Amino acid sequence: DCEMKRTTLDSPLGKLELSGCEQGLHEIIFLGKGPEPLMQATAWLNAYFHQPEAIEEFPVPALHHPVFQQESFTRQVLWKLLKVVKFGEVISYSHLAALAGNPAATAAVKTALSGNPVPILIPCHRVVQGDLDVGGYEGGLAVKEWLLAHEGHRLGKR
Ligand SMILES: *Cc1ccc(CNC(=O)c2ccc(C(=O)O)c(-c3c4ccc(=[N+](C)C)cc-4oc4cc(N(C)C)ccc34)c2)cc1
Ligand SMILES: [Zn+2]
């Protein structure tokens, strides 16, 4: 029950609506086909597409989607995925479940990821099925393959 502003921006994947309150960025939507949090979001995202050399030098906006408010399994998944899976790497679902404190919760990791409010920022596209299988993507498989090809990964396809 937040009150939020909305920014927009051009991307190699279409136009990207950013939504967020004062306490933090809520969502990042893709359509395609001001305040500090969203100011840092728009900056980071262009750092990602156009100057990825030093993506790690742009700061990560605070996040205030409800999923991050109280503790959950979904929150530990998303928070750990953001902290450890860097640009250029990937992680299997099964191994992300282990990283989030339950090596047998792969199905729950799959579901935790489907409700990610801020793609790329939280790198849900770096979570693959296996060494040779990139898996699905809730943004569309070609997006995932694009993003991984953008990061130079062997499972990318542009
Ligand atoms: C990590 C991550 C999460 C979310 C996105 C962006 N995707 C969406 O926001 C999103 C919104 C709504 C739908 C929807 O169907 O209403 C989807 C979506 C699917 C979401 C989850 C899913 N599984 C968990 C199996 C499957 C989805 O399939 C979709 C299919 C279509 N079409 C066939 C048109 C459209 C939307 C789908 C996604 C990005 C990254
Ligand atoms: Zn909020």
Residue numbers in the entry: 4 to 36, 55 to 179
Paper lines:
The self-labeling protein tags (SLPs) HaloTag7, SNAP-tag, and CLIP-tag allow the covalent labeling of fusion proteins with synthetic molecules for applications in bioimaging and biotechnology. The three most popular SLPs are HaloTag7 (HT7),14 SNAP-tag (SNAP),15 and CLIP-tag (CLIP)16. To guide the selection of an SLP–substrate pair and provide guidelines for the design of substrates, we report a systematic and comparative study of the labeling kinetics and substrate specificities of HaloTag7, SNAP-tag, and CLIP-tag. We complement these kinetic studies by reporting crystal structures of HT7 and SNAP covalently labeled with rhodamine-based fluorophores, providing a detailed understanding of their substrate preferences.
SNAP was engineered from the human O6-alkylguanine-DNA alkyltransferase (hAGT), a protein involved in the repair of alkylated DNA by transferring alkyl moieties to its reactive cysteine. SNAP irreversibly transfers the benzyl moiety of the substrate to its reactive cysteine, leading to the release of guanine. The structure shows the same α/β topology with two domains as observed for hAGT and other SNAP structures. The TMR moiety strongly participates in the crystal packing, engaging in interactions with the neighboring xanthene ring and protein in a sandwichlike topology. As a consequence, and in contrast to HT7-TMR, SNAP does not interact with the bound fluorophore in the X-ray structure presented here. In the crystal structure of TMR-labeled SNAP, a structural ethylene glycol forms hydrogen bonds with both the backbone carbonyl oxygen of I31 and the carbonyl oxygen of the amide linking the benzyl to the fluorophore. This benzyl-fluorophore amide is also forming a hydrogen bond to the backbone carbonyl oxygen of residue E159 via its Nα atom. We modeled the SNAPf mutation E30R in the structure of TMR-labeled SNAP to gain a better understanding of how it affects the labeling kinetics. The results suggest that an arginine at position 30 could interact with the carbonyl oxygen of the amide group in the label via a moderate hydrogen bond (3.2 Å), replacing the hydrogen bond observed with the ethylene glycol in the crystal structure. This could lead to an increased affinity for the substrate or a better substrate positioning for labeling.
